[PDB]
C-alpha cells in the first residue's frame with residue numbers, strides 16, 4: 001500500500017586503520033536537536049507508523065485495558081522499621097505520586113506524612129523522588145528530587161518538629177547522600193556541570209549556605225562512578241569508587257568533625273571489592289583470588305590481613321551479602337539458579353533457602369536493622385507472582401509478608417520449564433520458558449524469545465502480569481540466558497563481551513533453533529524482542545539469521561556500534577570500552593565491525609520489525625535506530641513491515657507515566673499478535 005519515508009543520503013566517509021566506511025545518514029545525528037530536516041524524518045516515520053498500525057487500535061485498547069485491570073488501584077508497601085520508626089509507602093487512586101508516612105515503632109493508630117509527592121509536584125512539569133532518609137536523631141528529613149527529568153537531583157531538608165523546610169538546596173547531585181551521626185552534617189555527590197558524571201563529594205552543614213560546603217574528594221578518572229554508603233555499624237561513611245572492572249573505597253569517620261578520606265585498598269585493574277563494617281570487623285566481597293568472588297573478614301584495610309570466610313568457587317557466583325546478629329546471609333548463583341545461604345558466625349552451621357520451581361529468582365530484600373533473626377527475602381517465578389517472605393534464621397519459620405496481586409489470574413493455567421541447549425561450541429545455555437497449558441500443542445504455538453546478554457546483567461526468570469496478554473493468546477514466552485549475561489556467573493559475562501561478544505548472538509540463534517527443533521513452537525511464527533544492548537542483540541541476530549524470525553521488536557537499540565565507539569563526544573562511549581572494546585585499536589575495530597548491526601545491514605530479506613527510540617533522555621541516542629531504519633529501507637529485498645516509532649513525549653514520573661509504559665507494551669504486543677494471526 002503506502003510509500004514509507006525516504007531519508008536523504010549524504011555520503012559521510014569515516015576512515016580508520018585505512019578502512020573507509022561510507023555512512024549515508026550520519027546527518028540524522030544532530031547534537032543540538034534544532035535541525036528541522038532531522039525532526040522532519042523522525043516525524044515522517046512516526047506518521048508512517050501511526051498509519052501502518054491504525055487497524056490494530058481495537059487490539060491495542062483490549063491489550064491496554066486487560067493489562068491495567070490486572071493491577072490494584074491501591075498500593076501500600078510492607079511497613080519496615082528503622083531507628084525506632086515504622087515507614088510505609090501509600091499509592092491512592094486519583095493521586096499521580098506516592099505519599100510517604102511513618103510512626104514511632106511503639107505506635108499503631110496514627111501516621112505522620114513525611115512527604116506527599118502530589119504536593120511536591122504541584123506547579124512543576126516533572127517530579128521524581130530519587131531519595132528519602134531521616135537523620136539518625138529522627139528530627140530531619142533529607143529528600144533527593146528531580147524537577148527537570150535530566151536525573152540531576154536537588155537535595156532539600158525538612159524539620160520534622162514543625163514540618164518547616166530549611167532554606168538551602170544542594171543542586172546537580174546524583175541523589176546519593178549520607179548523614180553523619182550528629183544529624184547536622186550530610187555528605188553528598190555532585191555531578192560534573194557538563195558530563196553530569198558523579199565526581200565530587202561535599203560535606204554540608206544542614207541549614208547553611210551550600211557556598212560554605214567543603215570539597216572532601218574529587219575523582220580524577222571519569223570511568224569511576226562515585227557513590228556514598230554508610231556501614232551497618234554506623235562508624236564509617238564509604239566513598240565507593242568503581243568502574244565496570246575496578247573498585248576503591250575511602251573511609252569517612254561518621255562520629256567526628258573534620259574527617260578526611262582514609263584509603264582502604266588502592267585501586268588495581270580487575271580487582272572489584274565492596275565492604276561493610278559490623279561486630280568491629282570489615283567484611284569484604286572481593287574477586288582478588290577468583291572471578292566468582294569470595295567474602296573476607298579483616299580488622300583493618302591492608303589486603304594482606306584479609307581472612308577467607310568464603311573462598312571463590314568456579315561453580316558458585318557470590319553476588320552479595322547481608323550481616324545479622326548471629327548470621328551471615330549470602331546471595332549466590334549456581335547451575336543457573338539464584339540462591340540464599342546462611343552461615344552462623346559461631347557454630348558455622350550452613351542452611352540453604354529451599355524452593356520447588358524450575359524457573360524462579362530469589363534475592364535479599366530490604367533489611368535495614370541487623371539486630372534480628374528475621375531475614376526478609378524476595379521470590380518470583382514465571383508462574384508465581386512476586387512475593388516478600390520473612391524467614392526466622394534460627395527456627396526456619398517462613399511467613400509471607402506480601403504477594404503481588406494479579407486480577408483475572410489462575411496460576412495453574414500456566415506451565416514453565418528450564419531447558420539446557422548445547423550451543424554450537426558445545427557450551428550448555430540455560431533457557432526459561434512459560435506457556436498456557438490448555439492452548440498448547442507441540443510445533444503449533446508462536447514463540448516470543450527475549451534476550452539482553454550484556455554487562456553481566458541476568459534476565460532472571462520472574463513473574464510478569466503484562467506477559468499474560470501473550471500467554472493467553474497461545475504464545476510460548478522464552479528467556480534465553482545467553483552469554484554476556486550473568487546467569488552462570490562472571491565467566492558467563494566474560495564469554496559474552498569484548499573478543500567474545502559474538503557468543504551472545506550465536507547463543508540466541510542456537511537456543512531459538514533448538515526450541516523449534518524440539519517442538520516448543522511454530523517455526524513460521526518465531527518472534528523476538530530486546531532493548532538497548534538487547535537491541536544490539538536483535539540487530540546482529542537479524543543480519544546473521546534473517547530467516548529464523550517472522551517478526552522483531554528492537555527497543556532503543558545500540559546498532560551504530562563502530563561509529564559511536566570511535567567518538568568520545570557521545571555520552572557513555574568513554575565508559576563502555578571494557579564492554580565492547582576500543583575500536584581505535586584495529587583488533588577491536590575488526591571484531592566489533594563484524595557484528596555492528598548498522599554496518600552489516602545488507603541487501604537481503606529481513607523479518608517484520610518495529611524499532612523504538614526517544615528524542616529526550618536516552619542511553620542509545622535517537623539517531624542510531626533512525627539511521628538503521630533508513631539503511632534497512634534502502635537495501636532490504638523483502639516487502640514486510642519496517643516501522644520506526646520515536647517517543648516525542650517529555651517524560652512522566654506519575655501513575656500516568658506507568659500507564660504510558662502499558663501503552664508502549666500494548667502497541668508492541670498488538671504488532672506481534674497481528675503478525676502471528
Ligand SMILES: *CC(=O)[C@H](CCCCN)NS(=O)(=O)c1ccc(C)cc1
Nearest residue numbers: 531532533558564572573576619620
Ligand atoms: C541499553 C543498555 O543496555 C546500555 C545502557 C544501560 C545501562 C544500564 N545498566 N547501553 S547500550 O548498551 O544501550 C549502549 C548505549 C550507548 C553506548 C555508547 C553504548 C552502549
Ligand SMILES: *CC(=O)[C@H](CCCCN)NS(=O)(=O)c1ccc(C)cc1
Nearest residue numbers: 096649650651652653654655656657
Ligand atoms: C501526568 C499527566 O499526564 C497529567 C496529570 C493529570 C492532570 C493534573 N494536573 N494528565 S494529562 O492528561 O493532562 C496529560 C498531559 C500531558 C501528557 C503528555 C499526557 C497526559
